[model samples]
Target: TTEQQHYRDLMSAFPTGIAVVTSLDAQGVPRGMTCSSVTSATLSPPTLLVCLRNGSATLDAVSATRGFAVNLLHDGGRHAAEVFSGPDPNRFSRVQWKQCRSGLPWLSKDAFAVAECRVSGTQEVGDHTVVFGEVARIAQTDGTPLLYGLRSFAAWPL
Candidate 1:
């Protein structure tokens, strides 16, 4: 109750870059969700981790494909952030995207950088699954990153 609210406040105060984690579903359809619960988990081999809701469609796709792409949103990707974060089934239709070499969906127009990663492992905790990824490839362009915290979005000021 109060403790959970405290935790939320603490995390909300810690602003971080926003990303859309995408993967192909069992039928080869793209599935994705806006995620800010991503972080680097290791240095050697360059591992990253994303926390996905246990039963989310995006997590199901990631589990089946064993691969995914993390699209790091640019400051101009605010609309994309809103679409994916909500319970909208047509989230993909609202954004410009393309498939990567591995066939994972990438938000090409909204993301300034994208990281392709293979699912190295996964752990279930509470209502979420922590997926560890081994970065397989990375692509980037010059742009300021979109950030989220305190329930709001903003472009990097510096």
Candidate 2:
């Protein structure tokens, strides 16, 4: 108990960029979640990985579609992050988004950039699954990145 609480505090100290990982399920349902667990895995073939909870609807949609989009949040995107992270059933209806060329949901207004990643592989570990994706397409804009840590949302002042 103490170990996990201490571990969580340690994790909270490390700031990470925010991202909304989105996917379209087989039934045309769009699913998404605010995820800070994205990391560049390799340069060759350009790969990245995001750790998603095992039973999350977004993860299920990712598995079904075999792809997902990583919408990198800007400073102004904090509201979008909170919206997707919560238990709001009509989250998609509220955000300004569109299906990109790859047919993945892209948070057009909130995200500074969106990366369409094709699922390359996945591995189960504890309460989550590591979904590795190869970057297939990218759409970007100019904006400061949004970050999370220290129990708060912040913007990279640049």
Candidate 3:
């Protein structure tokens, strides 16, 4: 197998939590994208990291506004994931969300948790840029988080 395929297969074996990272575009319109590359980076300062495609609109927005929100999805949030992962420019139309104080979008329903953050740093890594954010606020509900593995969605604790 090729290196790329091997990498894909190996990574697929690891389950990852799914989230939708949101930010406001240049026009002040909410923009978000399905994100699986999210993790808590620190606890002392409450930091998190999310990886986004280099040229994605959501990434651009995060760069411009220096703020974002990570909406942790529940098991039923697969449809919202699909919408944000697609090429549709108006993904928000299909999902229920509200603007946060930072002007970032936060998924209102089917989200287990939401973290509002301010960009602390950024690094270019291969084809994606890793954004580090300091959590300013957090809201959570009791539920299982949506998981992804083997290129498909799964329930957590599997």
Candidate 4:
């Protein structure tokens, strides 16, 4: 079937950087989730995009907080990814963070880089909504970015 083949082919062909997209919920509680879909859309305007499922709890957080931070993960951050994407109780419990200029909670340290974003608009795509955000500020931590490929974290030479 095209559906099955499409998914297989798509997965095989794509490489992505891992990141944790974080924000504060309506109750002022920190909430976040991991995704490999984040990408830079523009440099002049300093924009980025993230695709979120419609039912994600972080959706409300992104809407209410009006912004979020993209923490580009490193090799050791697979645990952080699991924590955020796992059940709610364990999320953010062990992670340390700081508030960005727009009030979004960003990782205190560990990310290869942090992109603080102010959501500007959204577009519906199939079962997910693509959020476009203007990058407001950024901080970098030196390291090779954690990358996801073929359903596993990977590295490259040269």
RMSD of each: 0.8, 0.7, 1.4, 2.1
lDDT per residue as tens, model 1, 35-61: 998899998889999999999999999
Q: Which pairs of residues have clashing backbones in candidate 4?
A: none
lDDT of 3 by residue, 47-114 (tens): 99999999999999999989999999999999999998998667888999888766779898868899
Q: Give the TM-score of candidate 4.
A: 0.88
lDDT of each: 0.94, 0.95, 0.90, 0.81
Task: Name the better of 1 and 4 by lDDT.
Answer: 1
| Model 4 agreement with the true structure over 16-43: per-residue lDDT tens digits | 8788999888888887888888977998
Worst 10 residues of 2 by lDDT: 85-94
Question: Which stretches of model 1 miss by more than 4 angstroms?
Answer: none
- Relative to the true structure, candidate 1 reaches a TM of 0.97
Worst 10 residues of 3 by lDDT: 97-106
Ranked by TM-score, the better of candidates 3 and 4 is: 3
Report residue 116 deviation for candidate 2 (angstroms): 0.3
- The candidate scoring highest on TM-score is 2
* Model 3 regions more than 4 Å off: none
List clashing residue pairs in candidate 1: none
